[PDB]
Amino acid sequence: STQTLQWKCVESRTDSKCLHYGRFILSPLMKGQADTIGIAMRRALLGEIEGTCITRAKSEKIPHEYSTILGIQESVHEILMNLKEIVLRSNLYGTCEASICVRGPRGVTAQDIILPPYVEIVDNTQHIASLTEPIDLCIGLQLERNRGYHIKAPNNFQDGSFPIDALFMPVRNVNHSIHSYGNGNEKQEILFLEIWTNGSLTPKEALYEASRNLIDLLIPFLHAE
Amino acid sequence: AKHVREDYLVKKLSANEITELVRGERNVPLIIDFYATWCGPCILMAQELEMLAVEYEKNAMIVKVDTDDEYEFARDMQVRGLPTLYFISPDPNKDAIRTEGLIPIQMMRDILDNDM
Amino acid sequence: YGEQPTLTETSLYRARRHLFKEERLKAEQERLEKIGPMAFYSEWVKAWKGDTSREAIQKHFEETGEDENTQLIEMLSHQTDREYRIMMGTDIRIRRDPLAMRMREDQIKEIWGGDPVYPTINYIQDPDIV
Amino acid sequence: DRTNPLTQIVHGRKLSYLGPGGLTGRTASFRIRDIHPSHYGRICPIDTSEGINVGLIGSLAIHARIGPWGSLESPYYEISERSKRVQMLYLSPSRDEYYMLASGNSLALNQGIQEEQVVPARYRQEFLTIAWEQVHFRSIFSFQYFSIGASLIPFIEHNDANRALMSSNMQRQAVPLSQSEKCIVGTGLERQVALDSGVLAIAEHEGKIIYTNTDKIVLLGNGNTVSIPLVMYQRSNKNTCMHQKPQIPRGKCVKKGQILADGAATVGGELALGKNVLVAYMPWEGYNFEDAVLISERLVYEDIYTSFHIRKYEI
Amino acid sequence: ATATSISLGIDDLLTIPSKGWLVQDAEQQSLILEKHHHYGNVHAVEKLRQSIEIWYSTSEYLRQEMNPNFRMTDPYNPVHIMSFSGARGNVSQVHQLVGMRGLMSDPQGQMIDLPIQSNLREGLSLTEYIISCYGARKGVVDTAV
Amino acid sequence: VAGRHGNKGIISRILLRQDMPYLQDGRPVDMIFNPLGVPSRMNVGQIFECSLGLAGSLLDRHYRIAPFDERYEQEASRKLVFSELYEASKQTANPWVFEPEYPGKSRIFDGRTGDPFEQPVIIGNP
Amino acid sequence: DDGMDFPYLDPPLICCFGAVQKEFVPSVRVSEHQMDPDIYSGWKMMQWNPPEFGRAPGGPVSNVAISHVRLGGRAAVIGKVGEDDFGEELVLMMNKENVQTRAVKFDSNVKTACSYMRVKFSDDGKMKMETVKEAAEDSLVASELNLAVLKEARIFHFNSEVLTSPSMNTTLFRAIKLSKKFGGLVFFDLNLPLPLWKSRDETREVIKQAWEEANIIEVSREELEFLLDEDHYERRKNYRPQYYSENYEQSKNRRDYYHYTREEISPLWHDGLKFLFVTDGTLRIHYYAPSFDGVVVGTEDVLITPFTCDRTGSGDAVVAGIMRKLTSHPEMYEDQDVLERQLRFSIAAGIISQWTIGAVRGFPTESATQNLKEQVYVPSMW
């Protein structure tokens, strides 16, 4: 009889290519609903959305992880560490392959990656390698889409296939607040949400996926048995 | 003595040596630093001059004068404050430059490059 | 009793803090009923030179279908991050007493007794220096 | 001991009553295991060795110096109405107890004269409170009565002196992590510890950095060209890596003695044995009972605490 | 113990209100007596026998007034709950953070003239901290003996 | 894992980021200590550092403080810490950094209930 | 110049005329002790034991203005800068700290802090220098004087450096005439440059015209004994009786804090003077008025922080505090008790200003100055 539930986006800043922020508001929520919505949405956003990333890097003519290469200022382990931060997008479950074959004194960035048709990078200037002298540099990579943090074994040696324990975190941070509405006798409350993502997704999409994963999870009970 | 490198590059010269340097023939810009030990801001000036003397390896000559030793000579050079630098052109046609205060090193570079 | 609190008044307010805090919070909540959410949540939303009163809100609702829920949402759309972060103190479960989030800088500086005599610029470094 | 740059420095400055021609841990009395009122400017009073040999092995004060005749000396500022030239002297224990060494301040004014204000002092082997007019010497250094380990504790004046021993002893067991990070709050002595640890690579000549590779740095200055080889990966006596890293890029200049390359747990020109982490003090579920900590997953997938250990098997 | 939660800040170490007067008055009698001691009014033993007695009486008066202060003004102070409930922390131990640590002892017996008139919250001075190290050493030459 | 003030510890559990208390800006806590350890060992010097660390993390500045700063003033460390906290709370609009009713403390929430722990908790960056 | 509608703001404005410079120490003499010509790591030992003229060394007028505005007052600066990067950064530094720059004139003819001289080898082989082109700071003409700062400002403050250049002599005298026509006081600071430390008679001839126009004068202890008699006032200081002391204080060989009588400073006194201040560093401040005189007692401490102590800029803070309390409290002129009470704020500011490296980096705040004043002085004094 009094008002209807409304939700809207009140702010969205693009601080950088791989960092996006978004604040949202909900309208006349009666008691108890706001806390449940806020806590469920925070948990879902922190641990339900899935984001693809590089999981295994294969290099040519390299003995081990802690080795040096002529003409490269960055050690191999440094290259793995720098390679873990590359952000990617996809929507299909399954592992894929990728490669990077670059010449010598260039300076290698994230735009030098070669990607399958359905995978694209979001930032295009993330430093991944620095080159000084002319040496042909060829590295193969594997891309995977999982949920949450996963740790992999060092198996599948080949010449060298170093597995990077990539973190599947598309949402950097989440916050919420439950204010008061002062609706006379009836106690209403205003709920504010706040999402920081890393550019793999965007607000109003991470929120969508996080709501849908939750409504996935709550569902078995509706069926009888 | 060629075995261990000198910690400080700026060489302290007396008044007469400075007179000989200015009077005699030169081919590189000359820097004259006025300083005293009791001086407050002169430690920073000494550090900046030491840094500047490394970038300009052989293209400039940097010397310093202690006003506690040569006071009348410093007074004659129209010095009215301790953190003072004198830029001397390698040619007698161009006039000298007097800079007062704790000037930044970049302006010093501009002074002895674009004006000397 | 006089101009400055005495050592007994302070040690008594230390015992009865929560009563005064509850009175302040009750007054702040009671303000919402008369004022209305629209005008109450406008002190922290600067750069919205509207009406903020539940007399012309009804006039706007008669002019356009927006009720006293979409005008509030519209004002809460030019808030800026800092103003929202400060406004969050009126949260239903944080409950900052109104006196705390409105004290002047002079009053807050008296908690530790003014600036330090030894300047803090001697301690401050830069996290990106060698 | 090469666990971390701190331990290399700490090991060199040690004193012990043990060894040939000295006392042992069994036939040592209890008075020899106490702080005499003379190990003040010379021997740290809160850094010793726990166990049976307690009070027999200690460290040196930061400003301490072995003077003539093998006597430890400490600096003190002489107060006299002549203004000689250098007002600081290196006092020996024999000349220490016959002077009145103030440790107070001149920030106190009464309706009379300032020279009758009272400050604590140290005459003979006691602690008096005297007027400013009968003060012969005045210690002015904060890092004068402590050692290297005890001077790395911020706000040490707020910690009980009982805990200082183990606060100092738990910094020599730190593991140099893979990537280092500087401390937000410190005492300012980390810079000199890093300088003197020997882990760094300091320039021995002037000039410009004309070549850098992650195996070497080549500098050109005053004609000759100097090559400095870096330490890429090595093994410590306690099975820990020692990984250096260049600091200044190509083309820039360095004076003598300035830093050229970093080292293990030495980000910047400063010592760095740990990481800054958000912390909340609260009993969570009994999982922090007694002295238990409850860390999060963020410390294991961002490599916040991750170190390389190299073991040497010889056959 | 979680839902309620407890923590130790800087303003929860609640020094009793009357310490401002007692320490000031204790300093006055130490100033007057040490000023008359130079006039020949009193001898050395009397000066020694009093500088030990003001700071012992004052310190033991703050300690006995700690709980009545806590139990009436701030019954739920985190330091009070931790110690009064018997979980962890003696009355003497709380007195070190709140109150006075005065009258430490020289290793060969005997008290030291200089009293530690500052908390651990306020922060000891250089001479006061060094005095507190005398009792620090004979805390580890005891656990090993 | 050990601090610089003699507060040692044994890691007991490792929790996912969604299962830990978060401040009023949503940032999950990275480590949880036991408060009772402070009255026992009597090392208050950590708490100061704790609070001060927070200020640094919110101001991009590092402090190099010599010991025994209580010679210039009375309770000088308190002035330093509280002034830095207020400056960090004012320059960056985070009114939870310096709560002017229990300075240095703030009311954190529960990571698995969305409820505020009933009493304010001291947080920092040690 | 009469354009205004509403009354002026609460803190009266201060007029700061001179040259804008960064970290400048005018007063230079021959120090007896030197600490190594190369190693600057040990030069700080000359800050614990100053050469008795750099005990509280004053600096440029911009430093005084910055210290005054940082103490809770309001100041404006008149000067000229070049169209350089240094000139554009000096005004930025002054603007960042609420110093009004409405009267700072930018010009392109001359360069900031750079003056062109010429080598003029004389008889024998002693070189000389003659100013061919003047520096930007000392190139202000009377036409470009902001006739709004002068009208509003209630105290006109300038230092003796402007007396070393020809054009600024006329410009300064014109500004003084304008300010006096508008009813403002004249504050004279005697931070003597090096060339003015040559002889007493020449300096007295040089500064007489400016001295006779001043309403308030502030000089150091050495800048007064130099102006009256250096040899006599140095022989009087180092004197101990051959047989027996006189009272008892003479039997303790304490430092010499001599309060000059009104018959010794009479040659430096005139009818228009309202105050004469002689500062022995931050230790003591002797104040002389038309009807009374006295000494305010203070202290100093640079060994409290031996590694971050730098006496440069303390005199500017002392003068700025004096001006701030003069403008805030207008009853100090004829009340000795209020005068003594309000003159300890300046001492506290001067004490704080010596605890950090850099003249402008660590000027104290008003709250910090009040805190130190209350912590050092007994409640009866403060």
XYZ file of N, CA, C and O in Angstrom, chain C residues 17 21 81-83 85-89 91 93-97 100-101 103-106 108-118 120 122-128, chain F residues 22 24-25 60-66 69 72-73 75-76 78-80 82-84 86-87 90-96 98-103 107 109 114-116:
328
model
N 27.486 7.769 30.958
C 27.610 8.068 29.532
C 26.425 7.556 28.722
O 25.816 8.302 27.938
N 23.911 9.269 25.838
C 24.027 8.822 24.453
C 22.694 8.303 23.930
O 22.312 8.588 22.787
N 31.590 9.869 -3.092
C 32.002 8.772 -2.222
C 32.201 9.233 -0.784
O 31.733 8.582 0.158
N 32.904 10.352 -0.595
C 33.242 10.796 0.755
C 31.995 11.129 1.562
O 31.900 10.785 2.748
N 31.031 11.807 0.939
C 29.809 12.162 1.649
C 29.028 10.923 2.057
O 28.485 10.868 3.164
N 30.366 7.954 2.645
C 31.131 7.294 3.695
C 30.902 7.967 5.039
O 30.803 7.293 6.071
N 30.816 9.297 5.046
C 30.526 10.010 6.287
C 29.084 9.767 6.722
O 28.802 9.586 7.913
N 28.150 9.743 5.766
C 26.744 9.532 6.088
C 26.504 8.156 6.688
O 25.569 7.977 7.476
N 27.342 7.179 6.336
C 27.186 5.818 6.840
C 27.163 5.749 8.365
O 26.728 4.734 8.917
N 27.583 6.810 9.058
C 27.534 6.825 10.510
C 26.134 6.756 11.083
O 25.970 6.380 12.249
N 24.030 4.594 10.322
C 23.585 3.232 10.075
C 22.792 2.714 11.269
O 23.013 3.118 12.413
N 22.882 -0.093 12.694
C 23.614 -0.962 13.602
C 25.016 -0.472 13.927
O 25.715 -1.129 14.705
N 25.449 0.652 13.365
C 26.694 1.281 13.793
C 26.445 2.245 14.943
O 27.162 2.231 15.947
N 25.423 3.089 14.801
C 24.905 3.921 15.885
C 25.990 4.821 16.479
O 26.351 4.716 17.652
N 26.511 5.710 15.642
C 27.363 6.784 16.131
C 26.487 7.869 16.738
O 25.524 8.318 16.110
N 26.809 8.278 17.960
C 26.010 9.298 18.621
C 26.103 10.609 17.846
O 27.180 10.963 17.352
N 29.069 13.068 18.277
C 30.422 12.712 17.863
C 30.692 13.121 16.420
O 31.745 13.690 16.113
N 29.754 12.840 15.515
C 29.948 13.105 14.097
C 29.580 14.530 13.704
O 29.437 14.816 12.509
N 30.977 17.223 16.019
C 31.877 18.063 16.796
C 32.827 18.816 15.877
O 33.283 18.288 14.858
N 33.126 20.057 16.242
C 34.062 20.854 15.468
C 35.480 20.312 15.624
O 35.770 19.494 16.501
N 36.368 20.779 14.747
C 37.762 20.355 14.812
C 38.402 20.783 16.124
O 39.234 20.059 16.685
N 38.019 21.956 16.634
C 38.577 22.446 17.890
C 38.245 21.514 19.047
O 39.104 21.228 19.890
N 37.448 18.275 18.887
C 38.112 16.987 18.714
C 39.591 17.095 19.061
O 40.177 16.170 19.635
N 40.219 18.223 18.724
C 41.631 18.410 19.038
C 41.902 18.408 20.535
O 43.048 18.200 20.944
N 40.881 18.634 21.362
C 41.074 18.657 22.805
C 41.079 17.268 23.427
O 41.325 17.150 24.632
N 40.803 16.220 22.647
C 40.829 14.865 23.189
C 42.245 14.485 23.601
O 42.469 13.931 24.683
N 43.222 14.776 22.746
C 44.619 14.528 23.063
C 45.378 15.797 23.417
O 46.567 15.722 23.739
N 44.723 16.955 23.376
C 45.319 18.183 23.865
C 46.150 18.949 22.858
O 47.290 19.319 23.148
N 45.596 19.197 21.677
C 46.266 20.025 20.698
C 47.389 19.309 19.971
O 47.634 18.113 20.141
N 48.087 20.078 19.142
C 49.160 19.523 18.337
C 50.348 19.138 19.218
O 50.558 19.724 20.282
N 51.131 18.141 18.804
C 52.347 17.807 19.551
C 53.358 18.942 19.486
O 53.452 19.662 18.492
N 54.122 19.095 20.568
C 55.142 20.137 20.598
C 56.286 19.790 19.652
O 56.804 20.657 18.941
N 56.692 18.528 19.625
C 57.697 18.077 18.673
C 57.026 17.803 17.333
O 56.124 16.962 17.268
N 55.596 16.497 13.885
C 55.502 15.159 13.316
C 56.232 15.047 11.985
O 56.495 13.930 11.528
N 59.181 15.430 11.428
C 60.463 14.770 11.634
C 60.352 13.256 11.532
O 61.349 12.593 11.230
N 59.169 12.698 11.783
C 58.962 11.258 11.715
C 58.514 10.787 10.340
O 58.824 9.657 9.950
N 57.792 11.625 9.598
C 57.142 11.179 8.373
C 58.183 10.936 7.290
O 59.012 11.806 6.992
N 58.143 9.749 6.698
C 58.951 9.389 5.544
C 58.043 9.179 4.338
O 56.827 9.381 4.399
N 58.646 8.765 3.228
C 57.912 8.485 2.003
C 58.090 7.011 1.670
O 59.237 6.545 1.548
N 57.012 6.237 1.522
C 57.152 4.779 1.371
C 57.813 4.335 0.077
O 57.964 3.125 -0.128
N 58.214 5.248 -0.801
C 58.783 4.893 -2.096
C 60.113 5.600 -2.308
O 60.374 6.189 -3.359
N 35.086 -8.085 9.132
C 35.422 -7.003 8.223
C 35.114 -5.668 8.879
O 34.155 -5.551 9.648
N 34.224 -1.443 8.781
C 33.063 -0.752 8.240
C 33.267 -0.273 6.807
O 32.384 0.401 6.268
N 34.401 -0.588 6.186
C 34.589 -0.371 4.759
C 34.584 -1.670 3.966
O 34.817 -1.642 2.753
N 49.786 6.932 3.057
C 50.983 6.755 2.235
C 52.186 7.467 2.851
O 52.913 8.202 2.181
N 52.380 7.256 4.150
C 53.528 7.800 4.858
C 54.058 6.759 5.829
O 53.309 5.919 6.333
N 55.359 6.824 6.087
C 56.034 5.910 6.997
C 56.676 6.705 8.122
O 57.259 7.767 7.889
N 56.569 6.184 9.340
C 57.078 6.850 10.528
C 58.330 6.147 11.033
O 58.371 4.916 11.115
N 59.343 6.936 11.376
C 60.592 6.443 11.949
C 60.775 7.163 13.280
O 61.396 8.227 13.344
N 60.236 6.577 14.343
C 60.126 7.231 15.641
C 61.233 6.719 16.550
O 61.339 5.512 16.793
N 62.051 7.633 17.059
C 63.042 7.263 18.052
C 62.353 6.926 19.374
O 61.280 7.454 19.675
N 59.971 9.152 23.460
C 59.468 10.440 23.008
C 58.685 11.170 24.086
O 58.155 12.253 23.823
N 59.815 15.263 25.429
C 59.307 16.549 24.965
C 58.049 16.947 25.720
O 57.865 18.122 26.060
N 57.175 15.985 25.990
C 55.824 16.260 26.448
C 55.465 15.247 27.526
O 56.308 14.474 27.989
N 52.711 12.172 27.782
C 51.878 11.368 26.890
C 52.007 11.856 25.446
O 51.026 12.189 24.779
N 53.254 11.896 24.970
C 53.510 12.357 23.611
C 53.130 11.310 22.572
O 52.666 11.662 21.482
N 50.668 9.214 22.776
C 49.219 9.314 22.630
C 48.844 10.444 21.681
O 47.999 10.273 20.795
N 49.475 11.609 21.848
C 49.206 12.734 20.959
C 49.546 12.381 19.521
O 48.759 12.634 18.604
N 50.720 11.783 19.307
C 51.136 11.417 17.958
C 50.141 10.461 17.316
O 49.660 10.702 16.201
N 46.986 9.673 18.115
C 45.624 10.167 17.939
C 45.557 11.244 16.866
O 44.605 11.279 16.078
N 46.555 12.130 16.807
C 46.575 13.142 15.760
C 46.713 12.508 14.384
O 46.031 12.914 13.436
N 47.589 11.506 14.251
C 47.730 10.831 12.967
C 46.441 10.119 12.576
O 46.039 10.146 11.407
N 43.354 10.940 13.476
C 42.366 11.939 13.082
C 42.675 12.509 11.705
O 41.760 12.743 10.908
N 43.953 12.746 11.409
C 44.316 13.253 10.089
C 43.988 12.240 9.001
O 43.515 12.609 7.921
N 40.247 12.284 8.485
C 39.721 13.502 7.883
C 40.130 13.659 6.423
O 39.294 14.015 5.586
N 41.403 13.413 6.098
C 41.853 13.548 4.715
C 41.133 12.560 3.807
O 40.662 12.923 2.723
N 41.044 11.307 4.232
C 40.220 10.307 3.571
C 38.992 10.085 4.441
O 39.119 9.698 5.607
N 37.808 10.319 3.878
C 36.585 10.380 4.677
C 36.228 8.972 5.139
O 35.398 8.273 4.555
N 36.881 8.554 6.220
C 36.652 7.257 6.851
C 36.403 7.515 8.330
O 37.314 7.383 9.158
N 35.177 7.895 8.698
C 34.907 8.295 10.086
C 35.061 7.180 11.107
O 34.916 7.445 12.305
N 35.345 5.949 10.689
C 35.561 4.858 11.629
C 37.008 4.749 12.088
O 37.288 3.985 13.017
N 38.982 7.190 13.455
C 39.084 7.884 14.736
C 37.667 8.130 15.241
O 37.053 9.151 14.928
N 37.149 7.187 16.017
C 35.850 7.370 16.644
C 36.019 8.246 17.877
O 36.716 7.844 18.815
N 35.409 9.426 17.929
C 35.663 10.319 19.066
C 34.847 9.954 20.293
O 34.340 10.835 20.989
N 34.723 8.659 20.574
C 34.191 8.182 21.848
C 34.979 7.021 22.425
O 34.814 6.716 23.609
N 35.816 6.361 21.631
C 36.770 5.370 22.128
C 37.924 5.339 21.143
O 38.041 4.424 20.320
N 38.796 6.346 21.188
C 39.753 6.552 20.096
C 40.665 5.354 19.885
O 41.112 4.709 20.836
N 34.008 -0.472 15.567
C 33.055 -1.573 15.666
C 33.113 -2.370 14.368
O 32.591 -1.940 13.337
N 32.362 -5.945 12.116
C 31.216 -6.820 11.929
C 31.671 -8.274 11.886
O 32.865 -8.581 11.901
N 26.917 -11.185 9.547
C 26.558 -9.814 9.250
C 26.086 -9.043 10.458
O 25.227 -8.167 10.330
N 26.629 -9.350 11.636
C 26.268 -8.691 12.875
C 27.470 -7.956 13.452
O 28.603 -8.434 13.335
N 27.260 -6.798 14.075
C 28.378 -6.082 14.700
C 28.691 -6.667 16.069
O 27.797 -6.849 16.899
